[PDB]
Amino acid sequence: DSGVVQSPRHIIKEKGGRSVLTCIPISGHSNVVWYQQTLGKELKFLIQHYEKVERDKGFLPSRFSVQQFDDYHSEMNMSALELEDSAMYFCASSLRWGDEQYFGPGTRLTVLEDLRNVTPPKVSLFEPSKAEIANKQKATLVCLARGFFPDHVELSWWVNGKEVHSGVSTDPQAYKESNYSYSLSSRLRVSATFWHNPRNHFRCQVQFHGLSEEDKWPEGSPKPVTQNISAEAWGRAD
Amino acid sequence: MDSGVVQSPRHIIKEKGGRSVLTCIPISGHSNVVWYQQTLGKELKFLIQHYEKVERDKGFLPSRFSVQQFDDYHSEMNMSALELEDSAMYFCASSLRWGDEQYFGPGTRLTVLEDLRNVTPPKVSLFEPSKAEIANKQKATLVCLARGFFPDHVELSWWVNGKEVHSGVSTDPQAYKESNYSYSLSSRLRVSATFWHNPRNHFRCQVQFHGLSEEDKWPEGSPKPVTQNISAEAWGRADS
């Protein structure tokens, strides 16, 4: 029917800052647990509330406090943020204390020393090379998204308005091209015949997760908010 | 409690098209065991559940994975025809019975690569504090850099006079990729200038790299990138 939901999904904060994560448990569940997970590592139990009462606590830092409300939703208030706080934060709910836990999608928090380096990607689509097509009868489009920071992007391919996965090969993880700039590439391979149809449309779509409306930004340059950036091309006859 | 769920292996590197088996031992007395898959930085994906040896719930488990629970209630996921996209953390969790609170294992980090020849241990460098810092802040920060390694299978720790320390340590939460086949990670240890001003204080940045297995093949001509410990160290110093 539905599962645990959380908000926000991605958030970027400056060191010394403050934010609040919220969790809505499955309807009828009254027990809510929070975990912290450094990317690629184990889940770390933080705290558990059942009928608003704290039942058990792990290594919840004193800078963090959690409260559960009448409707059983839970909020973690995180203050005086440190770089070390960059992690995934999962909430999970169960009907009662002692029962099976159902997991939320997680909130990814990234804490930076200076928000002034945050910047969205530029995205370029490259049509197939003549040599590739002549030699293999396949046609590979390259999408390059780069110049972005931090590394919170999601790249997808759309052909004639529909998302595709067949023939898609995306780099598993963006890499740094310089201190405050990432690069990520993807390829979509189709048949030469499919590419040679002028009426086929191709779009590489990137979603960048950045600053929110809320965040302060000094005059001068556009605020690097969450936004979509894409590049497109049509097929091309011989 | 007395113990928790354990898993094996903790890290493993496989080539595309290969096969491996991940194993989970539940908390003693628990007979319900579930597996989850998690791609780096994403949500947990429920794979499958066994209780008293019988499959109950199943999520989207690829046909290439098969899971079995055994007499002693431990569970094994046999993974075949591995794909790059199978690179993930795999958690198991156990509960007394189905429907009960589940307890998580530490996870197995599976990395699937196109070419094992890209696997490389880190170079580790320790930097003594700058004279400017000591003079102006009366603190002394040592920097440890561990870089040029692949894949992202490094753990960094600090040891002062033979004992692990945490006070004054700031380690990057995540290594970043320098390029498609190389990572970098840094850490700082800050101590007082007076503590650094002692020739007999010893400082060591210790890195553990999880690499290829004893069983993996490796061509002649360069050292095999096996699991190994790599460190850098310094003693404190008199006035200069």
Side-chain angles (χ1 to χ4, degrees):
Chain A
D1 189 74
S2 67
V4 177
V5 291
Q6 288 177 247
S7 175
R9 184 163 57 94
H10 284 270
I11 173 149
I12 302 177
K13 296 302 292 188
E14 203 171 89
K15 184 181 69 190
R18 175 181 217 113
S19 213
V20 182
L21 278 41
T22 306
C23 178
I24 294 174
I26 291 175
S27 181
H29 285 197
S30 68
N31 185 77
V32 175
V33 171
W34 285 90
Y35 297 89
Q36 179 187 48
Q37 183 191 40
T38 295
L39 266 63
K41 306 300 180 56
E42 80 259 12
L43 290 177
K44 290 186 295 197
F45 175 72
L46 296 176
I47 198 171
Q48 164 172 249
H49 291 89
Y50 171 52
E51 304 278 1
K52 295 183 297 192
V53 183
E54 187 186 309
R55 296 308 163 119
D56 200 1
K57 189 205 288 184
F59 284 103
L60 186 73
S62 75
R63 293 176 291 107
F64 293 6
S65 60
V66 175
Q67 179 180 7
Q68 180 183 43
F69 297 76
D70 281 359
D71 64 11
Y72 299 136
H73 95 271
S74 179
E75 299 183 9
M76 187 157 68
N77 200 340
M78 309 174 80
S79 70
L81 290 168
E82 307 176 1
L83 306 177
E84 81 163 25
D85 299 330
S86 299
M88 298 286 315
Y89 294 85
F90 291 97
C91 76
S93 76
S94 64
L95 184 59
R96 261 177 282 279
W97 176 27
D99 292 337
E100 174 176 22
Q101 291 175 19
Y102 289 68
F103 277 77
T107 292
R108 180 169 164 179
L109 167 71
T110 299
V111 187
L112 304 170
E113 271 170 14
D114 182 352
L115 297 181
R116 275 176 307 184
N117 299 122
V118 177
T119 199
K122 302 45 158 173
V123 179
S124 294
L125 180 59
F126 297 78
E127 297 178 21
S129 73
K130 175 172 44 169
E132 185 195 10
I133 291 164
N135 283 318
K136 329 193 221 175
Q137 285 308 114
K138 302 299 179 184
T140 302
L141 287 80
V142 177
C143 181
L144 176 66
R146 60 154 299 266
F148 65 94
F149 192 79
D151 160 21
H152 300 169
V153 293
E154 300 175 68
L155 180 153
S156 57
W157 287 94
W158 302 73
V159 175
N160 293 326
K162 296 196 169 70
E163 184 174 10
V164 303
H165 296 287
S166 185
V168 170
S169 178
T170 298
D171 294 340
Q173 184 173 335
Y175 72 91
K176 277 197 174 186
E177 68 195 339
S178 58
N179 211 16
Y180 298 112
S181 190
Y182 279 92
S183 182
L184 176 72
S185 290
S186 184
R187 294 175 160 72
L188 168 66
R189 185 215 291 193
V190 295
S191 74
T193 292
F194 192 80
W195 165 254
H196 281 330
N197 178 1
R199 285 183 182 206
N200 286 328
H201 179 266
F202 305 85
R203 177 178 291 175
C204 175
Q205 179 70 248
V206 180
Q207 299 201 287
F208 171 77
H209 302 277
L211 303 184
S212 80
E213 295 190 9
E214 176 208 45
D215 285 307
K216 267 42 182 316
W217 195 255
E219 279 89 85
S221 60
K223 168 194 239 178
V225 295
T226 292
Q227 58 190 277
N228 300 321
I229 305 300
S230 67
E232 64 183 333
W234 291 84
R236 182 181 180 203
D238 286 280
Chain B
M1 35 169 38
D2 269 315
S3 68
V5 176
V6 292
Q7 287 181 246
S8 179
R10 190 156 68 88
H11 291 87
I12 187 167
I13 305 173
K14 296 300 299 192
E15 198 188 326
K16 182 193 173 77
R19 39 165 27 287
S20 65
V21 182
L22 313 191
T23 307
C24 174
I25 297 177
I27 290 167
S28 177
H30 284 197
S31 63
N32 189 74
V33 175
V34 302
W35 287 89
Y36 300 85
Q37 177 187 60
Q38 182 192 32
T39 297
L40 190 57
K42 315 280 200 202
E43 78 268 23
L44 301 178
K45 172 171 162 178
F46 167 71
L47 294 178
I48 195 160
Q49 170 202 11
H50 290 87
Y51 172 57
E52 293 183 328
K53 293 180 65 185
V54 178
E55 192 184 299
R56 315 295 173 154
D57 283 14
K58 189 208 282 175
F60 291 92
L61 180 77
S63 52
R64 303 177 288 105
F65 302 176
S66 64
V67 181
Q68 182 175 357
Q69 184 180 40
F70 295 84
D71 287 317
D72 65 7
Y73 299 119
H74 92 274
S75 185
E76 302 182 5
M77 184 154 44
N78 195 346
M79 312 178 61
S80 59
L82 291 164
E83 320 201 315
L84 303 181
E85 302 73 21
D86 300 331
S87 298
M89 192 74 23
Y90 295 84
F91 294 99
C92 73
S94 75
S95 56
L96 182 59
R97 288 185 274 278
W98 52 354
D100 288 344
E101 177 174 11
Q102 75 271 48
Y103 292 72
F104 277 76
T108 292
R109 182 81 166 267
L110 168 66
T111 298
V112 180
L113 303 175
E114 268 188 48
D115 196 333
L116 294 185
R117 298 170 316 205
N118 288 128
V119 177
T120 325
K123 319 308 195 338
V124 179
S125 306
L126 183 60
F127 297 76
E128 295 177 26
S130 80
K131 298 315 227 339
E133 189 195 9
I134 288 164
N136 294 325
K137 302 301 165 187
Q138 278 301 108
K139 300 294 194 185
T141 304
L142 296 81
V143 176
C144 183
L145 182 57
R147 65 150 303 272
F149 66 92
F150 188 81
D152 183 21
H153 280 204
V154 157
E155 304 174 294
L156 182 155
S157 60
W158 287 96
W159 300 73
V160 172
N161 294 323
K163 295 180 169 86
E164 182 168 17
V165 298
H166 297 287
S167 176
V169 174
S170 303
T171 299
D172 298 339
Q174 216 190 337
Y176 68 83
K177 287 184 81 146
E178 318 180 279
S179 58
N180 279 331
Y181 304 108
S182 186
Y183 289 80
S184 176
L185 176 79
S186 73
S187 184
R188 293 135 292 280
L189 168 61
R190 191 174 90 181
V191 296
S192 68
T194 70
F195 192 83
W196 172 251
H197 180 47
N198 183 350
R200 291 184 302 160
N201 284 332
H202 182 261
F203 306 79
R204 173 181 293 169
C205 176
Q206 176 67 254
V207 172
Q208 293 197 294
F209 172 70
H210 305 277
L212 298 190
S213 68
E214 190 177 21
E215 294 83 18
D216 280 314
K217 339 266 172 292
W218 188 259
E220 262 198 342
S222 90
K224 184 178 172 186
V226 295
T227 292
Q228 57 186 279
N229 299 308
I230 297 154
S231 70
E233 64 185 60
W235 294 85
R237 196 173 175 199
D239 292 336
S240 73

